[PDB]
From a paper:
Twelve KaiBRS molecules (monomeric in solution) bind to the CI domain of the KaiCRS-[name]/[name] dodecamer. The second clock protein, [name], binds the CI domain with the same fold-switched state in both systems. Following binding of KaiBRS, the CI–CI interfaces loosen up, which enables the formation of a tunnel that connects bulk solvent to the position of the hydrolytic water in the active sites. By contrast, full-length KaiCRS maintained its oligomeric state following binding of KaiBRS, which is probably due to the stabilization provided by the coiled-coil interaction. There was no interaction between neighbouring KaiBRS molecules within the complex, which suggests that there is a non-cooperative assembly of KaiBRS to KaiCRS. This result is contrary to what has been observed for KaiBCSE and KaiBCTE complexes. Our data show that the post-hydrolysis state in the CI domain is key for KaiBRS binding, whereas the phosphorylation state of KaiCRS has only a marginal effect. The interaction is controlled by the phosphorylation state in the KaiABCSE system, and its sole function is to sequester KaiASE from the activating binding site, whereas [name] binding directly accelerates ATPase activity in the KaiBCRS system regardless of the phosphorylation state. In summary, we demonstrate that binding of KaiBRS at the CI domain in the post-hydrolysis state facilitates the hydrolysis of transiently formed ATP after dephosphorylation of KaiCRS in the CII domain. Our fluorescence experiments detected a conformational change in the CII domain following KaiBRS binding, but we did not observe major structural changes in the cryo-EM structures.
Residue numbers in the entry:
A (entry chain G): 2 to 401, 407 to 463
B (entry chain S): 3 to 87
C (entry chain H): 154 to 257
D (entry chain H): 2 to 50
E (entry chain H): 361 to 401, 407 to 412
F (entry chain L): 309 to 360
Write the structure that this text describes.
């Protein structure tokens, strides 16, 4: 094995199997706006604040004010971390206007200043930002080439962990040929727009010395900073429970042996528009709340007040539980965020609230938000997170039976039918499948009223 | 009439730089300005204070607009033209 | 540097070019905020889009937002601004068909 | 946070969370006919009015 | 609005859906009663 | 296990005695090539008589 330095980003660290190599240079390639500067900034900040390693940030284009302001919003305090000297900023700017070159010169001041900063801060991590301006300033290319080859050799020679920010260009992953130099680790950041929707992706092009992830991982920049929830980290290690949950409908609960679906399982409610999927989900949430447990109802179709006065007709007084503080409503449109931020917000709020039943209505609303694979990845991540947390997930899906390839995981399936027969519409429901228990195989007709959902004899 | 020459160590570049400064200053012209030589190795801080990157450097501060010359001052004529007024 | 130094809010107009978002390399210089305007024709229909390529210092929208130039001027109604905060009413409306109205 | 200057365009302002940065240069890129000149013009006009 | 299906070929499905969603949300925020007429061929256009 | 225990199949007994192996791997965990490679490697190592 080889040494590795965590970068704070949990997803990237677990993708790299520990983080960036320790004592070796790393290249971060990508066009403008991809997030290389922020990547380096969180690298240094997390190293200083979590692993006790001082940092140095050598910037060739941006001034220290810009460098601090960039991350000021993310919640870090570079002013405080410099005010304490845990990160030392060196703005190494060269103006060619007052420069006339006679003879041969060595970038000796660069080394002297960088060494002074390293000894001042006891630094172990170094970031080199915008090293292309160094080439653009001086005229002789060979001297600059030799000087920074010596610089990289010197950084390796005293054993600091260095991250280099480089632009992409047009032909290769770099426009100044820094790939020729840095091959220990290459990370490409991309920002691509498809169907007017722009997404940010990360890829580990070449990581020398050990295995790592090779796919393109969509990442997000949020208030916390870099967040990466790779779909390859999900595992099938789910502790099962022998308890049962109450749906809130006595007839449906008795229809299945044991009194209800197993706790912590994934329950799908399928049906055509107007079948009553939302009504059943509200019944589940209200029944969970009535027992003193917490519940969340993610709605991508209706506002909180509209849902309230829709359910008040069925008698479910969701206002009581929302007002007592045991039920949460989100009421967020599918297009408000991107898929990554939908996932991140759902996960963050679920973790913060720590509920016992999460009802997502409807999971089909994300159909056109992206390609089928991206939506499936989001849904799989959400389902796996809920199952690992041991929360009862009630997902409502619209029918047109198989719907979107996500039934493939569900533990329990309830299909609600609203059929037209004999010149009139009749409601019915049946359990398409109920894992680990025996259940009725009858298409039980029901009739919703003020008392709630009631199955006929 | 003040000139500063930033160098680092007993380097061939810095030694040749100061020697060539001696030559151009003396043989070419009289002592119109006074030279001060600073070796950066002992004071890396002064490198940051004066914003110096590439060794050797010859900086004039007598005129309001600063002017720097980077290298060992091999071309006598070019150095003199750059320092002439 | 002088404009920043006396503290004025400056907006620079630059052409796109062929390789990058600018043909004279003004991206090298201005990185505080970059806004790309595009005018693309698909199936003979031309539409105008706006994108914030890089806005340094805080969050912002990252998708391509179709905009319009009208008598008022620039108008941008992003689809990401819609929210599910709708005040509901307990009154009823009359369809005008008595039978349909009584049916519900 | 950082300062921001509204540009009159409500949609763009709410997209940027306040508008363009105050005291910093902004670049408007685009081929001929995209509307950069009009963008700057409404910027100035709305700022003044 | 009669009919909302007339905008079928004006653009891609996503653009028409965005326009319809914006219109519906604007009307609902204003608290106006929106009556949309759609042609059938049941689910029609995802709206 | 607890799905089959309802049907009476006591897979725990055979897994615990060491005659039955469970993998429980998601399709997206690996690439297709590594799925194939892991399946082949573990099948060769275990030398079973029935693979489901
Ligand atoms: N008091 C009531 N008595 C009888 N039926 C009622 C009552 N209140 C509501 N309903 C029925 O409930 C139906 C709506 O049920 P619900 O909102 O649960 O369906 P859904 O499958 O979630 O719908 P959608 O596809 O719109 O999301 C109404 O169409 C009406 O038929
Ligand atoms: N508070 C924030 N929340 C979300 N994203 C942010 C925030 N601050 C900056 N960003 C993102 O960072 C990007 C610029 O990152 P940076 O790495 O400094 O530039 P580049 O990617 O060109 O190196 C912006 O385009 C923006 O999307
Ligand atoms: N009264 C108007 N109504 C609608 N569009 C207009 C009006 N006046 C100008 N335009 C638009 O402005 C465009 C030119 O804008 P301008 O920014 O000056 O040029 P460029 O985009 O090349 O910088 C024209 O192509 C036209 O579509
Ligand atoms: Mg950058
Ligand atoms: Mg519903
Ligand atoms: Mg113009």
């Amino acid at each position: 094995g080889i040494g590795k330095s965590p970068t704070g980003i949990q997803g990237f660290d677990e993708l790299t199997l520990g983080g960036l190599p320790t004592g070796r240079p790393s290249l971060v390639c990508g066009s403008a706006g991809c997030g290389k500067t922020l990547f380096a900034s969180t690298f240094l900040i997390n190293g200083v604040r979590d692993h006790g390693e001082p940092g140095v940030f050598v910037t060739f284009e941006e001034r220290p004010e810009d460098i601090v302001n960039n991350v000021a919003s993310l919640g870090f305090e570079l002013d405080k971390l410099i005010e304490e000297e845990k990160i030392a900023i060196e703005h190494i700017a060269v103006d060619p206007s007052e420069v006339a070159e006679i003879g041969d010169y060595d970038l000796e001041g660069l080394f002297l200043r960088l060494e002074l900063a390293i000894d001042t801060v006891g630094a172990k991590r170094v970031v080199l930002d915008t090293i292309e301006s160094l080439f653009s300033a001086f005229s002789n290319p060979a001297i600059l080439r030799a000087e920074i080859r010596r610089l990289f050799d010197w950084l390796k020679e005293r054993g600091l962990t260095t991250v280099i920010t480089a632009e992409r260009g047009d032909g290769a992953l770099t426009r100044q040929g820094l790939e020729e130099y840095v091959s220990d680790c290459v990370i490409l950041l991309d920002h691509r727009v498809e169907n007017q929707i722009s997404t940010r992706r990360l890829r580990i092009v070449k990581y020398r010395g050990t295995a790592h992830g090779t796919n393109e991982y969509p990442f997000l920049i949020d208030t916390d900073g870099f967040s990466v929830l790779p779909v390859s980290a999900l595992g099938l290690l789910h502790q099962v429970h022998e308890e049962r949950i109450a749906s809130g409908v006595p007839d449906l609960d008795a229809m299945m042996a044991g009194g209800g679906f197993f706790r912590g399982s994934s329950i799908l409610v399928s049906g055509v528009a107007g079948a009553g999927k939302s009504s059943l989900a509200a019944h589940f949430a209200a029944a969970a709340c009535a027992r003193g447990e917490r519940a969340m109802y993610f709605s991508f179709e209706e506002a909180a007040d509209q849902a309230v006065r829709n359910m008040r007709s069925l008698g479910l007084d969701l206002g009581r539980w929302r007002d007592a503080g045991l039920l949460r409503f989100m009421a967020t449109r599918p297009t408000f965020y991107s898929l990554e931020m939908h996932l991140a917000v759902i996960l963050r709020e679920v973790m913060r609230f720590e509920p016992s039943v999460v009802v997502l209505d409807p999971i089909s609303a994300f159909t056109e938000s992206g390609d089928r694979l991206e939506v499936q990845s989001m849904l799989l991540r959400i389902v796996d997170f809920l199952k690992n947390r041991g929360i009862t997930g009630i997902f409502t899906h619209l029918a047109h039976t198989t719907d979107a390839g996500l039934e493939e995981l569900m533990d329990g399936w309830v299909l609600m039918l609203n059929r037209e027969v004999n010149g009139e519409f009749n409601r019915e429901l049946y359990l398409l499948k109920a894992r680990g228990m025996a259940h009725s195989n009858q298409v039980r007709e029901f009739l919703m009223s003020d008392r709630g959902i009631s199955l006929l004899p | 009439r003040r000139l500063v020459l930033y160098v680092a160590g007993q380097t061939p570049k810095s030694l040749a730089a100061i020697s060539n400064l001696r030559r151009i200053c003396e043989e070419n012209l009289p002592g119109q300005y006074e030279v001060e030589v600073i070796d950066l190795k002992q004071n890396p801080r002064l490198a940051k204070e004066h914003s110096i990157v590439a060794i050797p450097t010859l900086v004039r501060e007598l005129p309001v607009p600063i002017r720097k010359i980077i290298g060992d001052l091999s071309d006598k004529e070019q150095v003199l033209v750059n320092l002439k007024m």
